[PDB]
Amino acid sequence: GPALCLFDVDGTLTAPRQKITKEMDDFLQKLRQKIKIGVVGGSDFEKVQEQLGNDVVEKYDYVFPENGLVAYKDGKLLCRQNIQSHLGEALIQDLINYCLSYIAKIKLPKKRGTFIEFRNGMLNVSPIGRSCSQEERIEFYELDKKENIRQKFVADLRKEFAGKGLTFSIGGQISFDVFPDGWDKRYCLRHVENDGYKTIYFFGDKTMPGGNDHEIFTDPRTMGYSVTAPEDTRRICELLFS
Amino acid sequence: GPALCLFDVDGTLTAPRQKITKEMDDFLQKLRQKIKIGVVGGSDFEKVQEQLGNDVVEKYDYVFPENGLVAYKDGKLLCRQNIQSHLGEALIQDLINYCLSYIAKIKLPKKRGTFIEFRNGMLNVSPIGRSCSQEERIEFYELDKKENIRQKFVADLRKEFAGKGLTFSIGGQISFDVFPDGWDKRYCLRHVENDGYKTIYFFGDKTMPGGNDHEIFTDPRTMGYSVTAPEDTRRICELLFS
Ligand SMILES: O=P([O-])(O)O[C@H]1O[C@H](COP(=O)(O)O)[C@@H](O)[C@H](O)[C@H]1O
Ligand SMILES: [Cl-]
Ligand SMILES: [Mg+2]
Ligand SMILES: [Mg+2]
Ligand SMILES: [Mg+2]
Ligand SMILES: [Mg+2]
């Protein structure tokens, strides 16, 4: 039937931490005369503007910053969501409080600031604090590997919550993420599944387990295609759609 | 002997929350041919630039953002000190552990992120979180006066950290500052002290007890003058140097 193309932005339509190239933007616009297109990224709408231009809403059929928590369709905002409204202030506080209480009891060499980073689609938690220096990150990550600090504090959170529909995911060097079950890139799919697309292609570059694009790639609702770079995305699109 | 003028920024050289007027800027420079001048404010270096001009450091003999924890003299940065090194890493971790445990215990309509912001010469603490939106900021502000949330917090903090050489100051809407005794605006006198000034004049619009200019005004190293606006600062300086 009719189809949709969904692209990760960073690493797929663009080179890592680089803006789109006029040549690729033009290919995509030519491709829209053949098929509906849309983009999905973990970054806020401001960042996505930096990456694809301030006219992005008018140039793509769908735009899904924040893994879809914000959604634009045919130039209008289709929907907007945040972790606060979903989980609720009560539950959002029970979680903050426990995290705070628990971090007060961790004996560390150092503590700094921003232990809780509130993002609209997750809560970053950092025993040391994100404001640490790079040399303090390393000191902590090494200590974590011998004492397993992050792993035990997720463990105790998975016991006390998680029946509230919460996922916990250790990542990077100093923090872990608390986000509702399924609020990875798969979230965006809810805004396009009821629009009548017999097949939804998806292109991304972190397609293997761990990556930003893994969970959406493996979803049975997508025709998943891995990519290595923008040039490769044109290559594949040229072959799929002539 | 030779002398130095030190000016509070907001309200003394500028109308509150506004840039300086070109009239006032060019006056100061005419004075500078008669006297070394300097400025001091609580705000980070970038904010000072926005009030006095990008090239502040070249137009003022001394420049003291963050009450002087960051300091420029004749264009170049002076030796620096941070709260971690002064108070020690145990009192920092014991003061963070306490603040964290206490926030977890506060019942509030909303809690968000960045409850402790780790600055060069202080720690904010925001019961609600500095990442809060604007609507949430006013909410906490207008509830705080009904239930004296911050006022009550600062009080218990003083009891527990009595004698530890720390000061506390509720400022603004959502937070209070914790800083070593002596790290108000009078921190900067450490730099201009000596350097052969027989008289150090100081101007400030919040001379009254509890104001950010009080302790530097009363400090005996300074010849303090209370100001009611930029145009008044002129009157006193025109009375003194003409
Ligand atoms: O309002 P906030 O929470 O951002 O607070 C801000 O302003 C306060 C005073 O500002 P003023 O004297 O102009 O009211 C400062 O003490 C505080 O460190 C700063 O973060
Ligand atoms: Cl925090
Ligand atoms: Mg990518
Ligand atoms: Mg698939
Ligand atoms: Mg002032
Ligand atoms: Mg004095």
Q: Beginning with the edge strand found earlier in the chain, give each strand of the sheet holding B166-171 in spatial order.
A: B116-118, B123-125, B175-180, B166-171
Three-state DSSP string of A4-24: EEEEECECCCECCCCCCCHHH
- Residues of B contacting chain A (CB within 8 angstroms): 84, 89, 92-93, 96-98, 100-101, 103-105, 108-118, 123, 129, 131
Q: Compute the distance between CA of residue B108 and CA of residue B68 in angstroms, rounded to an integer.
A: 35
How far, in Å, are A21, A34, A212, B27 from residue A238 at the CA level?
Answer: 17, 11, 25, 67
Q: Which atom of ligand 1 is nearest to the CA of B16?
A: 13
Q: What are the φ and ψ backbone dihedral angles of B72, each rounded to 5 degrees?
A: -115, 135
The answer to whether B69 touches B76, Cβ cutoff 8 Å, is: no
Q: Compute the distance between CA of residue B127 and CA of residue B121 in angstroms, rounded to an integer.
A: 20
Q: Beginning with the edge strand found earlier in the chain, give each strand of the sheet holding A166-171 in spatial order.
A: A116-119, A122-125, A175-180, A166-171
Q: Given the structure tokens 């960045």, which residue do they identify?
A: B114
Cβ burial, residue A124 (10 Å; 0-12/13-18/19+): buried
The answer to whether A50 touches A56, Cβ cutoff 8 Å, is: no
Of B242, B192, B184, the C-alpha closest to B222 is: B192
Of A130, A121, A158, A93, the C-alpha closest to B103 is: A93
Instruction: Tell me how the structure was determined.
Output: X-ray
Of A60, A52, A57, the C-alpha closest to A4 is: A60
Resolution (A): 3.1
- State the count of interchain CB pairs (< 8 A) between A and B: 72
Cβ burial, residue A49 (10 Å; 0-12/13-18/19+): middle
The Cα of A89 is separated from the nearest Cα of chain B by a number of Å equal to 6
Is there a contact between A116 and B113 if contact means CB atoms under 8 Å apart?
Answer: yes
Strand ranges inside chain B, DSSP E: 3-8, 36-40, 62-64, 72-73, 76-77, 116-118, 123-125, 166-171, 175-180, 199-204, 223-226
Interstrand relation of B72-73 and A76-80 (parallel, antiparallel or unpaired): unpaired
Of A137, A111, A103, the C-alpha closest to B88 is: A111
The total of other beta-carbon atoms located within 10 Å of residue B18's CB is 11
How far, in Å, are A213, B11, B42, B213, B224 from residue B208 at the CA level?
Answer: 59, 14, 17, 8, 12
Q: Compute the distance between CA of residue B226 and CA of residue B213 in angstroms, rounded to an integer.
A: 9
How does DSSP classify residue B19? P
Ligand 1 touching residue B171 (CB < 6 A)? yes
Q: Candidates B10, B118, B124: which one to mutate for ligand 1, based on the most atoms within 8 Å of Cβ? A: B124
B233 assigned binding-site residue? no
A115: helix, strand or coil: coil
Distance A218 CA to ligand 1 centre (A): 48
The answer to whether B3 touches B197, Cβ cutoff 8 Å, is: yes
For this structure, is A10 an active site residue? yes
The answer to whether B217 touches B206, Cβ cutoff 8 Å, is: no
How far, in Å, are A5, B72, B80, B219, B241 from residue B56 at the CA level?
Answer: 52, 10, 19, 26, 23
B140 assigned binding-site residue? no
Tokens of B84: 């971690």
The bound ligand whose nearest atom lies closest to the alpha carbon of B227 is 5
Is there a contact between B118 and A116 if contact means CB atoms under 8 Å apart?
Answer: no
CB < 8 Å to A118, chain B: 112-114, 129, 131
Cβ burial, residue A105 (10 Å; 0-12/13-18/19+): exposed
The Cα of A129 is separated from the nearest Cα of chain B by a number of Å equal to 9
How does DSSP classify residue A71? E
Strand ranges inside chain A, DSSP E: 3-8, 36-40, 62-64, 70-73, 76-80, 116-119, 122-125, 166-171, 175-180, 199-204, 223-226
The total of other beta-carbon atoms located within 10 Å of residue B31's CB is 18
DSSP notation for B203-226 = EES--STTSTTHHHHH-TTSEEEE
